[PDB]
C-alpha cells in the first residue's frame, strides 16, 4: 500500500518508538561505559549487569508501548512482523526510521554526559570480538536474533498490529546477551548497532556494521519461516 496516514494515532506510534529506542540506548550504553571507566576491578555491575540493562530495558519498554505502537524498539522485530504481514510496508519503514533516529539520540546524551570514557572504551559500539571471524559473528547474530524473534511471535497477543508480552523478551534479550557479549558485544537490533556506530564513528565499527543488519534480518526471517512450517 502507501496510503495509511490515519491521522493522530500513528504519527504517534512512530513517536512511541522514538522515545523508546532513545531511553533504551541511553540506559544500556549509559551502563556499558559505566563498566569500563573502572579504576578498581570487581567494582562495577559487571557484564552480568550489562546483560540485565539490555534485557530489562526491553521488558520495561515493550511494557510501556505494548498497546500504543505494539512495542518493537528494534528493526529486526519490525521486519519479522512485516515478513508475516502482521504490519504494512509503510508502518514498517516509519518504525525503522523512528528507531534508528532514537537510537542515535540516545548514544548522544550518553556522549555528552559521559565524554572521555565514551571514546576511551568502545563507545557501546559493536565490533567483531577479537579472536573470532566475520562468519562466526554473523552466525551468532543470526541465531541470537532468531531466539529474540521466535520469542516475539510467541509473544504475539491475538487481540492491525498485535499486543506483546514482556517478561519473555525481557528474558529473550537478556539470555542472548549472556551468550553473545564476548563475541560481538551482542546486537540483534540494527538500530541499537547503527546508533552507536553513528556516534562513535570509527572505521573498524563501520567496517563490521553490515553484520548487524544482515545477521538480524536473516535471523528474523528464519523466524517467520519457523512460523511458516508450523
- Closer CB to a second copy, 114 or 125, in the complex: 114
- Closer CB to a second copy, 36 or 206, in the complex: 36
For 108, 119, 139, 189, 223, the CA distances from 58, given in Å and listed in that order, are: 19, 25, 23, 11, 19
- Closer CB to a second copy, 89 or 154, in the complex: 154
Strands 163-164 and 156-157: antiparallel
CB of 164 to a second copy, least distance (A): 8
- Closer CB to a second copy, 2 or 112, in the complex: 112
Sign of the Cα torsion 39, 182, 107, 60 reads: negative
CB of 26 to a second copy, least distance (A): 6
CB of 156 to a second copy, least distance (A): 8
For 51, 93, 188, the CA distances from 146, given in Å and listed in that order, are: 18, 21, 9
DSSP state for residue 27 in the 8-state scheme: H
CB of 112 to a second copy, least distance (A): 8
Cell numbers for 100, please give them: 534508528
CB of 108 to a second copy, least distance (A): 12
How many Å separate Cα 17 from the centre of its chain?
12
- Closer CB to a second copy, 64 or 89, in the complex: 64
Sign of the Cα torsion 208, 117, 30, 182 reads: positive
How many Å separate Cα 210 from the centre of its chain?
15
- Closer CB to a second copy, 168 or 206, in the complex: 168
- Closer CB to a second copy, 75 or 117, in the complex: 117
For 4, 87, 147, 148, 187, the CA distances from 179, given in Å and listed in that order, are: 40, 30, 12, 13, 12
Sign of the Cα torsion 33, 123, 96, 210 reads: negative
CB of 114 to a second copy, least distance (A): 7
CB of 214 to a second copy, least distance (A): 17
Amino acid at each position: 500500500d502507501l496510503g495509511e496516514l490515519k491521522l493522530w494515532s500513528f504519527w504517534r506510534a512512530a513517536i512511541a518508538e522514538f522515545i523508546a529506542t532513545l531511553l533504551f540506548l541511553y540506559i544500556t550504553v549509559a551502563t556499558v561505559i559505566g563498566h569500563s571507566k573502572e579504576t578498581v576491578v570487581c567494582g562495577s555491575v559487571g557484564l552480568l549487569g550489562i546483560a540485565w540493562a539490555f534485557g530489562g530495558m526491553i521488558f520495561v519498554l515493550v511494557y510501556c508501548t505494548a498497546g500504543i505502537s505494539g512495542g518493537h524498539i528494534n528493526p529486526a522485530v519490525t521486519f519479522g512482523l512485516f515478513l508475516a504481514r502482521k504490519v504494512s510496508l509503510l508502518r514498517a519503514l516509519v518504525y525503522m526510521i523512528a528507531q534508528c533516529l532514537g537510537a542515535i539520540c540516545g548514544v548522544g546524551l550518553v556522549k555528552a554526559f559521559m565524554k572521555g570514557p565514551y571514546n576511551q572504551f568502545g563507545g557501546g559500539a559493536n565490533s567483531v570480538a577479537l579472536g573470532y571471524n566475520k562468519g562466526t559473528a554473523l552466525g551468532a547474530e543470526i541465531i541470537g536474533t532468531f531466539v529474540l524473534v521466535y520469542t516475539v511471535f510467541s509473544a504475539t497477543d491475538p487481540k492491525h498490529v498485535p499486543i506483546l508480552a514482556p517478561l519473555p523478551i525481557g528474558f529473550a534479550v537478556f539470555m542472548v546477551h549472556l551468550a553473545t557479549i564476548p563475541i560481538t558485544g551482542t546486537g540483534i537490533n540494527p538500530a541499537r548497532s547503527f546508533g552507536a556506530a553513528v556516534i562513535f564513528n570509527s572505521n573498524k565499527v563501520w567496517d563490521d556494521q553490515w553484520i548487524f543488519w544482515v545477521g538480524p534480518f536473516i535471523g528474523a526471517a528464519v523466524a517467520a519461516a519457523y512460523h511458516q512450517y508450523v
